[PDB]
Design an enzyme around this catalytic site. Structure first.
Site, PDB file in Angstrom:
ATOM      1  N   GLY A  16      26.325 -28.958  57.774  1.00 35.11           N
ATOM      2  CA  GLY A  16      25.122 -29.855  58.101  1.00 35.11           C
ATOM      3  C   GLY A  16      23.868 -29.065  57.668  1.00 35.11           C
ATOM      4  N   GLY A  21      16.864 -25.573  58.671  1.00 37.24           N
ATOM      5  CA  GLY A  21      18.020 -24.929  58.584  1.00 37.24           C
ATOM      6  C   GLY A  21      19.013 -25.518  57.904  1.00 37.24           C
ATOM      7  N   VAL A  23      23.854 -25.311  58.271  1.00 34.60           N
ATOM      8  CA  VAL A  23      25.176 -24.677  58.812  1.00 34.60           C
ATOM      9  C   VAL A  23      26.096 -24.920  58.126  1.00 34.60           C
ATOM     10  CG1 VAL A  23      26.609 -25.101  61.082  1.00 34.60           C
ATOM     11  CG2 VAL A  23      24.280 -25.914  61.065  1.00 34.60           C
ATOM     12  N   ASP A 129      18.312 -32.654  72.202  1.00 34.93           N
ATOM     13  CA  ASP A 129      18.758 -33.137  71.006  1.00 34.93           C
ATOM     14  C   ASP A 129      20.515 -33.871  71.423  1.00 34.93           C
ATOM     15  OD1 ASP A 129      18.993 -34.245  68.546  1.00 34.93           O
ATOM     16  OD2 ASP A 129      18.841 -32.473  67.488  1.00 34.93           O
TER      17      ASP A 129
END
Ligand SMILES: *C(=N)N[C@H]1CCc2ccc(-c3ncnc4[nH]cc(-c5ccccc5)c34)cc21
Length: 276
Positions: A16, A21, A23, A129
């Site tokens: 992701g 950022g 992942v 979230d």
């Protein structure tokens, strides 16, 4: 085992991309023979961003629950290492397995997410979230909450927080107080949980997703248009074939005022009773 050497983290693929950022799926392979374990690794792509990333690591490392994705360690903070769940997120899992998963199974996932949220609330942690894309599948009968990129700890003397700038998440999971005044709390996480219950009961079908359905229900901008719809008391409709009791719980999660929404501790026993 909580310190991972960079040279031993082998890049496999992207899982992701966040705000600032990413992942990645890596193999932690100190032997260099491809026999090591797979891990999910988060890294920043800013001094405030670095402070917020260190805050996230400190939050996740202090969470110990069967219903929260496991913190594994850090690499030098340069990377956050977490367990990898190959079944991936609940959103995609439900779309793939819809014809196999019954109402009992959806209630079991609902109960697990609720137990994870009661635990986060007990740690004074606001998730901010919560959505089916951020819930991971450990196995066919076990889910876990993930994505702590926007999580925040409430100070001991205040049960909410205010953000200076409006959020960057798809607007369809935000409580009215977050849309209007950028206020977040454990009670706005309850509102988002109601949307997660909606997602579970639609099996995350894209045609009646929170985005598709709210946009269909909706010069004035989309955020203001959604806030108007919600303020009028309009809500997402009961999913196709949804048990009546489940839709009633969603409506309680979507009470206009945060003080009128049930707590996760009150929802938990109700979901467990419905599952039984
Ligand atoms: C569904 N398609 N979910 C996606 C969207 C983004 C993203 C990122 C990472 C994962 C993920 N998948 C498996 N195992 C994982 N362990 C931790 C995470 C994770 C890390 C940070 C934020 C969210 C999720 C994992 C899935 C998905």
């Amino acid at each position: 085992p909580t310190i991972f050497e960079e040279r031993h983290l082998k890049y496999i693929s992207q899982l992701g991309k966040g705000n600032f950022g990413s992942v990645e799926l890596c193999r932690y392979d100190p032997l260099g023979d491809n026999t090591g374990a797979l891990v999910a690794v988060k890294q920043l792509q800013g001094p405030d961003q670095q402070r917020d990333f260190q805050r996230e690591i400190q939050i996740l490392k202090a969470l110990h629950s069967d219903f929260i994705v496991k913190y594994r360690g850090v690499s030098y903070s340069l990377r956050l290492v977490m367990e990898y769940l190959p079944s991936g997120c609940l959103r995609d899992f439900l779309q793939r397995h819809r014809a196999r998963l019954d109402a009992s199974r959806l209630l079991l996932y609902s109960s697990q997410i609720c137990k994870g949220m009661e635990y986060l609330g007990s740690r004074r942690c606001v998730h901010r979230d919560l959505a089916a894309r951020n819930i991971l599948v450990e196995s066919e009968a076990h889910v876990k909450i993930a994505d702590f990129g926007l999580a925040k700890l409430l100070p001991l003397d205040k049960d909410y927080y205010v953000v200076r700038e409006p959020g960057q998440s798809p607007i369809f999971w935000y409580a009215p107080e977050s849309l209007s005044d950028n206020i977040f709390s454990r009670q706005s996480d309850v509102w988002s949980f109601g949307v997660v219950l909606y997602e579970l009961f639609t099996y995350c079908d894209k045609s009646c997703s929170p985005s598709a359905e709210f946009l269909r229900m909706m010069d004035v901008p989309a955020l203001s248009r959604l806030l108007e719809l919600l303020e009028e008391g309009q809500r997402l409709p009961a999913p196709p074939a949804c048990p009546a009791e489940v839709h009633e719980l969603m409506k309680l999660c979507w009470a206009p005022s945060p003080q009128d929404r049930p707590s996760f501790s009150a929802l938990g026993p109700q979901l467990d009773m419905l599952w039984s």
